[PDB]
Design an enzyme around this catalytic site. Sequence first.
Site, mmCIF file in Angstrom:
data_model
loop_
_atom_site.group_PDB
_atom_site.id
_atom_site.type_symbol
_atom_site.label_atom_id
_atom_site.label_comp_id
_atom_site.label_asym_id
_atom_site.label_seq_id
_atom_site.Cartn_x
_atom_site.Cartn_y
_atom_site.Cartn_z
ATOM 1 N N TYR A 27 0.781 -1.245 0.000
ATOM 2 C CA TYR A 27 0.000 0.000 0.000
ATOM 3 C C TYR A 27 0.802 1.279 0.000
ATOM 4 O O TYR A 27 0.265 2.314 -0.317
ATOM 5 C CB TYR A 27 -0.979 0.077 1.186
ATOM 6 N N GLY A 29 2.796 4.044 -1.370
ATOM 7 C CA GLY A 29 3.091 4.562 -2.685
ATOM 8 C C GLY A 29 1.991 4.099 -3.621
ATOM 9 O O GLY A 29 0.960 4.747 -3.795
ATOM 10 N N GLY A 31 -0.216 0.463 -4.542
ATOM 11 C CA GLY A 31 -1.167 -0.284 -3.757
ATOM 12 C C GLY A 31 -2.542 0.214 -3.352
ATOM 13 O O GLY A 31 -2.780 1.399 -2.992
ATOM 14 N N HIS A 47 -4.254 5.207 5.503
ATOM 15 C CA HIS A 47 -4.166 6.531 4.871
ATOM 16 C C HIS A 47 -4.947 6.520 3.532
ATOM 17 O O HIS A 47 -5.654 7.457 3.191
ATOM 18 C CB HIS A 47 -2.690 6.877 4.693
ATOM 19 N N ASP A 48 -4.817 5.422 2.803
ATOM 20 C CA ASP A 48 -5.502 5.144 1.541
ATOM 21 C C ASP A 48 -7.017 5.295 1.763
ATOM 22 O O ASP A 48 -7.696 6.044 1.067
ATOM 23 C CB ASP A 48 -5.279 3.648 1.222
ATOM 24 N N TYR A 51 -8.055 8.796 2.450
ATOM 25 C CA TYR A 51 -8.125 9.657 1.296
ATOM 26 C C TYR A 51 -9.412 9.402 0.548
ATOM 27 O O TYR A 51 -10.053 10.325 0.055
ATOM 28 C CB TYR A 51 -6.918 9.450 0.413
ATOM 29 N N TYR A 67 -3.181 22.480 2.387
ATOM 30 C CA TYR A 67 -3.813 22.762 3.664
ATOM 31 C C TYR A 67 -2.884 23.605 4.561
ATOM 32 O O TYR A 67 -1.787 23.984 4.161
ATOM 33 C CB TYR A 67 -4.256 21.461 4.338
ATOM 34 N N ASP A 93 -3.153 12.917 6.548
ATOM 35 C CA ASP A 93 -1.714 13.018 6.463
ATOM 36 C C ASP A 93 -1.089 13.016 7.850
ATOM 37 O O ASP A 93 -0.182 12.231 8.115
ATOM 38 C CB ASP A 93 -1.322 14.293 5.693
#
Lengths: 119, 119, 119
Positions: A27, A29, A31, A47-48, A51, A67, A93
């Site tokens: 995951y 990068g 993935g 994090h994926d 998002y 941000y 993030d």
Amino acid sequence: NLYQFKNMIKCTVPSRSWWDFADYGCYCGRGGSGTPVDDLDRCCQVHDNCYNEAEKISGCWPYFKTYSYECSQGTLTCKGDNNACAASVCDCDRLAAICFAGAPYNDNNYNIDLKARCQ
Amino acid sequence: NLYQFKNMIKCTVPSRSWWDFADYGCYCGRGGSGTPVDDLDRCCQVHDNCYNEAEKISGCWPYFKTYSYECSQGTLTCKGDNNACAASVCDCDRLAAICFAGAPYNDNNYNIDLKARCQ
Amino acid sequence: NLYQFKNMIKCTVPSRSWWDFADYGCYCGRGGSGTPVDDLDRCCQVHDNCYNEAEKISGCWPYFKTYSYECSQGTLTCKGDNNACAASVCDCDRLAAICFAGAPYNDNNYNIDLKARCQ
């Protein structure tokens, strides 16, 4: 945005290069498939998914959205002066950088064979 | 833009992850060299040639250009409220999504050895 | 921005596809670790260090920053009508394109095993 993310990882994991987290496990990068190979790979997974939800906000493109936040000696803070999209993204993030910091980094899980190791 | 393209493939190929088409064959994701290894790899090659044409318009950067479109239950439409760049890029994306939908997905052509398999 | 950089390499190395330099050695494309495997890999390393410096300017995100330049028959020029960020990024890009042009391209260093070959 992508550059600010890179800078959060620097805040919490100064010892490591942003590039180390760019092609790790299934995951980090790339993935979106497989099973996290390890803790750090799971951070990237989470994090994926984060998002993904931020994208449900109209006009919210995570890697492009700038941000407002501050790194104050190992400590991250997203500021109030962010709209919905900016606020959601900064938190994804911010939480990934903290996760990267307490997850051990396994060299062998770096630049792996996706096909062979990820479902 | 890149996010909107990802969302078009979701429209037409809901069953698959956008990451599946990110490193497939010689043209999906990376690529610009070799010979399509298969139908889906060809789609990617065509999308690429389409982007090239769109770039001939001054100030047109395909992955950054936000356009106006709508996915309505497996159905894609680019709207009229787009300038030339937006209009051309949406068309490239819309056509790639439909292509992806009727092209079989071969696992072994995923994350392949570029050097060995692409000229 | 990223598209403009691609177009600079086209100016100086017309014969090659921008994808050729996208996954070469330890620094071209990805990378930030290892030791340049060759001259071209060094070019990429230098470009990388150049981008780092440009980021030291507040609000300067190298791959997103649009600048003003012109390619005039194998000749690159960054124009004066650029702010500090644009000016610095154009310079990095312009110098990378020229570097690429005088550095030999080795096929075997394309799409290599990062782990195995990069520290």
